[PDB]
């Protein structure tokens, strides 16, 4: 029995063109991989326990989902432009609601989160001088759980719908009685599986940073990006359980007819808003803390100057981590709590703003009296300081409950959080991508197209969300689809131009990637240390070896690689390379996530037999992987010798040292 599946996919509406082009494009890659390398794509990628390849795959998934999230953004902006001035838009309400809920879910969970997790996966083991993450198979399984969530969300665009409830699915509207459709089930199961993956990767990175640091690198000689990653993983471990429990309770309400959040049989629908934001704000700092680290490096790297407030930045990040769990209620001020609770949580939300300001001034004083080379990443850093200051200012303006009563769900809130994400996580992920592109692929991204993309992005964002600040001051609320007030038409037609400019920016980024890959043989980062460098990640070949360090660095100082370059002990060939122990690539994750894609989908549609054979499949593949014993290999000294000789001869072909 196929159960609730049936065969209305999207036939009444024209969204089967996109479903038609996502299966055609798949066919294209199905041909392209056929006309080329398939065993490479399985042996090296798609089964890797290497943090670098898994981070690259995370970022690839993040970019791919960024294209669909931005398509949703363009459709929403054109729908709001058309609905204002009177004309009925090309999106009915039932589809516009799916579109904004999927934009929020894809962007928070499948664009912003995978991009940050991929940057951390690619960089953190290199910075701490570690060969690999603490739990490599758990990192592969976390990546493939994120892929399971991506696949479930994309399939929601095909068979069935996605939730028409908002990206957090508030409980009364997302209940089984008011949302009988399968959209909230897609939301629930993609989020549950992505949350499992994110929690596992938080455990992986927390343990990697705490335990697998290089000998001699104390915790305050650690790179600042690693500090930000450690704090973000603390937030992941202490928050994503909240999301898991909340979505599990919603699952029980929608499947077993329980009454956690129903409004009738003793259920308290406000407790979901308390819980979903109990994780909501920590996962908002899960996104912004690593990119802070991304700018703590890119500044100190592109100012030719030691990062100013290392202790101040570290303690500000720790304070942000501690305080992110005491601010949640600032997301439902208007729910009706007393003046004491609203005032207390507004005070804590304004208190959690001093560390971020200290970090901003630490970066702009790291630029003080430095050699600022305006590389693309440095432009992204200046843009981040400029726009993130505005976004945080507006957020603190919202942090006061009195202002939030009149600005709770206006377009001013939309402008706030898009200012702090686009000018935050998005700017920091593009900055990190350009900064560490040589440390992942060997090539260097085309700086011309990178600057073009940065300018388009910043200008388009500014000319697309400042109108939303004005609309928030005009009283326009979130998620309006049809018959907008024509009073709002001008600002929405200025925000449409900004969305078009951000489209041009994403196009410039795509062109940048294409030209960099086409011009790969030029700008080949021979030395494996472009744009100066101040951390251990730059003490390796531009594509790092699979072990990424023949001899673990000793890291006597804080800015290890810069100190090694100044001291002259930068590139030393060791007397002997010992055999080193590496984890072996394991495809079990694929299987512990293939049955995760089944189980979720067979749970979204009430296919109980297939959900049981997907859950049993996951658990039994986990048992089988537990029984596996040859999950490691000592790499022969010949391979290490050959790779290190190649790297050191390449250094000799430059200033040899």
């Amino acid at each position: 029995k196929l159960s609730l599946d049936a065969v209305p996919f999207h036939e009444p509406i024209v969204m089967v063109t996109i479903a038609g082009i996502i299966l055609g494009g798949l066919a294209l890659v199905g041909l392209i991989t056929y006309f080329g390398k398939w065993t490479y794509l399985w042996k090296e990628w798609l089964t890797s326990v290497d943090h670098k390849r898994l981070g690259i795959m995370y970022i690839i998934v993040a970019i791919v989902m960024l294209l669909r999230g931005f398509a949703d953004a363009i459709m929403m902006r054109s729908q709001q432009a058309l609905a204002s001035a009177g004309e009925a838009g090309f999106l009915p309400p039932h589809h516009y609601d799916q579109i904004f809920t999927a934009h929020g879910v894809i962007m928070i969970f499948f664009v912003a989160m995978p991009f940050v997790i991929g940057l951390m996966n690619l960089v953190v083991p290199l910075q701490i001088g570690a060969r690999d993450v603490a739990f490599p198979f758990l990192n592969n399984l976390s990546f493939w759980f994120t892929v399971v969530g991506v696949i479930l969300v994309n399939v929601s665009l095909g068979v069935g719908e996605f939730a028409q409830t908002g990206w957090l699915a508030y409980p009364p509207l997302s209940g089984i009685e008011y949302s009988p459709g399968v959209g909230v089930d897609y939301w629930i199961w993609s989020l549950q599986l992505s949350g499992i993956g994110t929690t596992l990767t938080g455990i992986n990175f927390f343990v990697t940073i705490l335990k697998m640091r290089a000998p001699g690198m104390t915790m305050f000689k650690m790179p600042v990006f690693t500090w930000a990653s450690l704090c973000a993983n603390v937030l992941i471990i202490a928050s994503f359980p909240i999301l898991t429990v909340t979505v599990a309770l919603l699952t029980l309400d929608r499947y077993l007819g329980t009454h956690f959040f129903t409004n009738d049989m003793g259920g308290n629908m406000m407790m979901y808003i308390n819980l979903i934001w109990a994780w909501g704000h920590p996962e908002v700092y899960i996104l912004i803390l690593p990119v802070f680290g991304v700018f703590s490096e890119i500044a100190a790297t592109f100012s030719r100057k030691r990062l100013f407030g290392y202790t101040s930045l570290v303690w500000a990040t720790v304070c942000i981590t501690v305080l992110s769990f005491i601010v949640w209620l600032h997301h439902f001020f208007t729910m009706g709590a007393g003046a004491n609770v609203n005032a207390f949580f507004g005070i804590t939300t304004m208190i959690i703003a001093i560390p971020t300001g200290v970090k901003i001034f630490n970066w702009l004083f790291t630029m003080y009296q430095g050699r600022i080379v305006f590389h693309s990443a440095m432009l992204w850093t200046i843009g981040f300081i400029v726009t993130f200051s505005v976004g945080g200012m507006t957020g603190v303006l919202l942090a006061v409950p009195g202002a939030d009563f009149v600005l709770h769900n206006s377009l001013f809130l939309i402008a706030h959080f898009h200012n702090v994400i686009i000018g935050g996580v998005v700017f920091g992920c593009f900055a990190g991508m350009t900064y560490w592109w040589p440390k992942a692929f060997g090539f260097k991204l085309n700086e011309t197209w990178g600057k073009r993309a940065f300018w388009f992005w910043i200008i388009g964002f500014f000319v697309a969300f400042m109108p939303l600040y004005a609309l928030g001051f005009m009283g326009m609320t979130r998620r309006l689809s049809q018959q907008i007030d024509p009073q709002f038409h001008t600002m929405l037609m200025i925000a449409a131009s900004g969305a078009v400019l951000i489209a041009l920016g994403i196009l410039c980024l795509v062109i940048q990637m294409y030209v960099s890959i086409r011009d790969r043989d030029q700008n080949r980062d021979l030395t494996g240390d472009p744009w100066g460098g101040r951390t251990l990640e730059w003490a390796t070949s531009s594509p790092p070896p699979f072990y990424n360090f023949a001899v673990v660095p000793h890291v006597h100082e804080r800015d290890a690689f810069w100190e090694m370059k100044e001291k002259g002990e930068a590139y030393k060939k060791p007397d002997h390379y010992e055999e080193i122990h590496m984890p072996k690539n394991s495809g079990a994750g694929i299987v512990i996530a293939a049955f995760s894609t089944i189980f979720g989908f067979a749970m979204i549609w009430h296919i109980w037999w297939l959900a049981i054979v997907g859950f049993a499949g996951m658990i039994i593949t986990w048992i089988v992987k537990s029984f596996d014993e040859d999950v490691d290999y000592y790499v022969p000294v010949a391979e290490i010798e050959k790779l290190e000789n190649q790297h050191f001869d390449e250094i000799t072909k430059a200033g040899l040292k």
Binding site: K211, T244, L252, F260, G266, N268, M271, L275
Partner: protein
Amino acid sequence: GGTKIFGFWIYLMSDCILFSILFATYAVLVNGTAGGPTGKDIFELPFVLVETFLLLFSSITYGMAAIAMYKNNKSQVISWLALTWLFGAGFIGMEIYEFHHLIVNGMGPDRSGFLSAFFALVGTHGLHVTSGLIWMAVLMVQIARRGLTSTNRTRIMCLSLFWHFLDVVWICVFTVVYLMGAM
């Protein structure tokens, strides 16, 4: 080596957060009874006492298994692990008995918000204990097949952390929901 044990400890901290969220939900919805059971009329505290004794016995037998794992004795480790699994299976079957008795009557999770929260918290602890029992069965099979090898000693320590953490969670459960439920 110890990295796996430390990472499982951090995951047990994540599960501490999960159980804290379920405890907050139970504390919110405890008075959310809708013309149904008030807790004091369904908890049957002798049941809770014998169940707490059973789970404490399971924890003690696992501790004996661990101290026998420090010594190089495969047989007694397996024996104590089987005893722990029997205690945990009794625990799980007794909670399935209680949940069945609630479900057959009109006092199911769908009856009221209080019963839904009770079922969430207690059945989540039950599913954790059941997953620990599946893990314990697999660990017994692997110990029998390969002995107390380095991989299995780490798994023994991780499952010890898991089992004692579940016992602590049950301490908090029987204190919060069962005892405070009956004044």
